[PDB]
Design a protein around this ligand. Structure first.
Ligand SMILES: CN(CCOc1ccc(C[C@@H]2SC(=O)NC2=O)cc1)c1ccccn1
Ligand SMILES: CN(CCOc1ccc(C[C@@H]2SC(=O)NC2=O)cc1)c1ccccn1
Lengths: 252, 249
């Protein structure tokens, strides 16, 4: 029943707004001429951006690291709002979060991104892509895939109410390793995919196959995480915040 | 025909899953360190014993507690047997003579899935009672569990999984040497077919393991020796079990 699906969509959108403060609409308002944040483009501009003696990439890197730990509490709160979720084997509840969190972190980071760079700290600042492309040797290309994805993903032109269902669809995947009770998982996701599809048909009629195109984005998204951990295997060789270790262990 | 035996194996595996909630793939998950969020309560002595009631003579409180899942295990076993191709079509009392003598042999086989060196999972994998704690009980219950642990340690070295276990369960059911059997020919017909399927299954799942088939059929001796030694030990001291101990041997 379609109205049951629309009700599903509104519940996720409402919950989404409560869990996540820097929504895409806000961020796109900031990024456009419709509100102002300090721009970091080289690093003369970086440390006038502190308002320091004497490596910058590591507290950028660990800066990134702790928005990850802020985002995890939000996502987890969000997930609790997905109908059928808390009612799952708590062992699958953490497998789902374990393999869902970075895919969502990167989906939502594209919202705070355009082709020049990325909104940082609740919209306070804006660091550029070419500046991130110019960081210290083991780093300096850790953002570039996120950016490549951000442009392709933002071309779909999703808004927050699309993104709320899509985020849920990611969490309830029936292909996570460690998934014991699968049938309840695929049962909810199949319902979320119907809601999404309907939500795509109403909100973007001009877009042919937008559903399809979006599901496909899931492959670049997975590829972001997979490449980032094999990047993470170059930093503790050659040359990280607790909560992350546990997520990264036994992760393919 | 090879592919049919495979097909027979799947039918058995799927019914095994359905009829048995506490499986070995999950039971081991608990027992290893792979369930990194929900873990069972340990009962390793007296003070840990009862502080547990809020989480899961005391000779009896464990004793009957066995019997009721033993009497509960009976349903899902008996339930299982009716998915075994050509079982319902058997004789309707060699059907029950078969269930009669094998029920325990099976429960003891599936008890080993929930066992390791230290103790045994209980109540839907919510508790875990140590073997030493069992050998230290009142009465002569004090060694009511020990042969079964002895069995498990040996049986688990065979390293069997559920899809292996599903088939072996059926091989036990359709014996061909219960006493109460008259229409025996059609049962040794089905077991002939189950054994082919087991043997082919074991070739595929365990190449590395030499004569795993024969080693596995041999475990059947110790297996019924357990049920045997068991009610020699139930003379020294529920309704449904009593029917079942009916001069069993
Ligand atoms: C340029 N930007 C935006 C990038 O913001 C993020 C980039 C990557 C992540 C994923 C983290 S980083 C890691 O190793 N693991 C993770 O989960 C999370 C956020 C900055 C820069 C400084 C401070 C905060 N933001
Ligand atoms: C240590 N464990 C696992 C043993 O679980 C069982 C042990 C024996 C049986 C066979 C029963 S006992 C008897 O005399 N006759 C029977 O048919 C059935 C189950 C506990 C401990 C407490 C409660 C339940 N389990």
């Amino acid at each position: 029943e379609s109205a049951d699906l629309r009700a599903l969509a509104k519940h996720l959108y409402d919950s989404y707004i409560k869990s996540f403060p820097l929504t895409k609409a806000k961020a796109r308002a900031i990024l456009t001429g419709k509100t102002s944040p300090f721009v970091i483009y080289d690093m003369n501009s970086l440390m006038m951006g502190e308002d320091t003696p004497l490596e910058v990439a590591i507290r950028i890197f660990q800066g990134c690291q702790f928005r990850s730990v802020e985002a995890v509490q939000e996502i987890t709160e969000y997930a609790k709002s997905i109908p059928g979720f808390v009612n799952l084997d708590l062992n699958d509840q953490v497998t789902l979060l374990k393999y869902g969190v970075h895919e969502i972190i990167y989906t939502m980071l594209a919202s705070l991104m355009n082709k020049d760079g990325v909104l940082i700290s609740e919209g306070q600042g804006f660091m550029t892509r070419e500046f991130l492309k110019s960081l210290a040797k083991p780093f300096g290309d850790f953002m570039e895939p996120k950016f490549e994805f951000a442009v392709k993903f933002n071309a779909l032109e999703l808004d927050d109410s699309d993104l709320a269902i899509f985020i849920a669809v990611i969490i309830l995947s029936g292909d996570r390793p460690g998934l014991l009770n699968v049938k309840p998982i695929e049962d909810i996701q199949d319902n979320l995919l119907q809601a999404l599809e309907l939500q795509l048909k109403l909100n973007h009629p001009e877009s042919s196959q937008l559903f399809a195109k979006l599901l496909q984005k899931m492959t670049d998204l997975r590829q972001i995480v997979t490449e980032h951990v094999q990047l993470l295997q170059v930093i503790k060789k050659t040359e990280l915040h607790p909560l992350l270790q546990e997520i990264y262990k036994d992760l393919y």
